[PDB]
Nucleic acid binder design. Structure first.
Length: 432
RNA sequence: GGCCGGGGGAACCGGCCAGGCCCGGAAGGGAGCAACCGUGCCCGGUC
């Protein structure tokens, strides 16, 4: 399905084939792999659109192959496309806790809970679960298993068709025992469509107990359709976050998670399916990225921020008076990094300015000629304690020759630079 | 004179050694600056 699109990814890392066309196809191509894999479309237009939008309103900051950029963008919107951005907060508000597990008809219904709970114990906490469902059979049962088979008791009431009590009952139990976290799956007679009734149930269910964290769930089996279901409820309870049962358990996915999002919906996990652990957290990227996997750039990318927003320092530095601050003639060497990591060397140098920046400065038609000597200035630095570069004025012949040799460079080179530092500023610092 | 800590040091040659520096085609090694690690390093005790 989609997966094999995440290939279009490197299928793209091919200088052989041209551009633009390369794009749109891919677009459509990826674009295809989606709906085909469930995925609603009404939306799409929007994405595919926004996508376009940008193009005719941007360009990759120089010093960086377009093809790549494209992605950041692609990726970029994949995010928004899906669970845009809000980093779900699945951990303790306080303790203990109330996990109201509202489920349509079964499906992950119970299961889920497991790894969920399961998960948090291998986090180090007094879980606690309860069979909060009496319409469909194997409540405890099938579940019951794991419970012990994981070292986590649980509790319920054979036959016994009546939530609330039992729930209430359970609850305070662990509580009385003072455990830390409770999980309790529930549901009712009529769900999908009669959703109205499902929730209708959760109504009391909720407002009777007084749960802190509440969640619904669904298998991508339903997909984009689901939307609604959940939707009606985001209203019931906005704090209402959810997850999608079965990943490896369908083939449609997308639309599922898609629809979700497109409601302001709130997820947290997903779990491929079987196995007591397949459950996983969740953060678009986490996944989006995941369906593109190798997304380095972001890295090399983010270095811009390193540089771009660092000259920030330069000019004049420190603010106000008194107390200790940060760093600077370190930031010196700091500059370094970014770039090299921010994509290979050279191409960039050329593609962009020296190290000062752009003021009443010296040296020809274009600022530089560090070309090689560059990866030399570096030599040391890392050949020196932190403090050193903070007090770039304690460079005794003694303390340095070691860096000299320690970095492998016969003296000279250094002394022969130390000033390209204490003078830079000198001039640099020449603010009126 | 037995132990955990707040901080705790360039260069009298320490553990891992990046970076680079050097010998050999690549292998892989050679000496080693920081870097964390502790020596050390000053005080409190050590159910």
């Amino acid at each position: 399905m989609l997966e094999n699109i995440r290939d279009a990814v490197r299928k793209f890392l091919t200088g052989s084939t041209p551009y633009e066309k390369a794009v749109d196809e891919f677009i459509k191509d990826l674009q295809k792999s989606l709906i085909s894999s469930d995925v609603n479309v009404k939306l799409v237009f929007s994405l595919t659109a926004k996508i376009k939008e940008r193009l005719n309103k941007e360009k990759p900051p120089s010093v960086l192959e377009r093809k790549e950029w494209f992605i950041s963008i692609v990726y970029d919107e994949l995010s928004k496309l899906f669970g845009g951005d809000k980093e779900p907060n699945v951990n303790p508000t306080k303790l203990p806790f109330i996990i109201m597990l509202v489920g349509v008809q079964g499906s992950g219904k119970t299961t889920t809970a497991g790894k969920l709970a399961y998960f948090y114990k291998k986090r180090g906490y007094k879980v606690g679960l309860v069979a909060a469902d009496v319409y469909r059979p194997a409540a405890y049962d099938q579940l019951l298993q794991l419970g012990n088979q994981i070292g986590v008791q649980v509790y319920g009431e054979p036959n016994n068709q009546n939530p609330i009590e039992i729930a209430k009952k359970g609850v305070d139990i662990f509580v009385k025992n003072k455990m830390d976290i409770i999980i309790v799956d529930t549901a009712g007679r009529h769900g999908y469509g009669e959703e109205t009734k499902l929730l209708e149930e959760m109504k009391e269910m909720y407002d009777v107990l007084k749960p802190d964290d509440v969640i619904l769930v669904i298998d991508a089996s339903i997909g984009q359709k689901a939307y609604d279901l959940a939707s009606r409820f985001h209203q019931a309870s906005p704090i209402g976050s959810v997850i999608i049962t079965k990943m490896d358990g369908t083939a449609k996915g997308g639309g599922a998670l898609s629809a979700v999002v497109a409601t302001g919906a709130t997820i947290k996990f997903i779990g491929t399916g079987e196995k007591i652990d397949e459950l996983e957290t969740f953060n678009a990227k986490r996944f989006v990225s995941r369906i593109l996997g190798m997304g380095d750039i972001e890295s090399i990318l983010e270095k811009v921020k390193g540089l771009e927003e660092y000259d920030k320092i330069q000019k004049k530095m420190e603010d106000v008076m008194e107390g200790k601050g940060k760093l600077t003639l370190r930031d010196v060497y700091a500059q370094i990094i970014a770039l090299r990591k921010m994509g290979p060397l050279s191409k960039v140098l050329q593609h962009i300015p020296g190290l000062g920046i752009m003021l009443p400065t010296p040296s020809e038609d274009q600022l530089k000629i560090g070309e090689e000597k560059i990866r030399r200035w570096l030599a040391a630095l890392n050949s020196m304690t932190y403090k050193e570069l903070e007090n770039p004025n304690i460079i005794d012949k003694s303390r340095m020759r070691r860096i000299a040799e320690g970095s492998g460079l016969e003296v000279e080179e250094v002394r022969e630079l130390l000033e390209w530092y204490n003078n830079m500023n000198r001039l640099l610092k020449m603010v009126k």
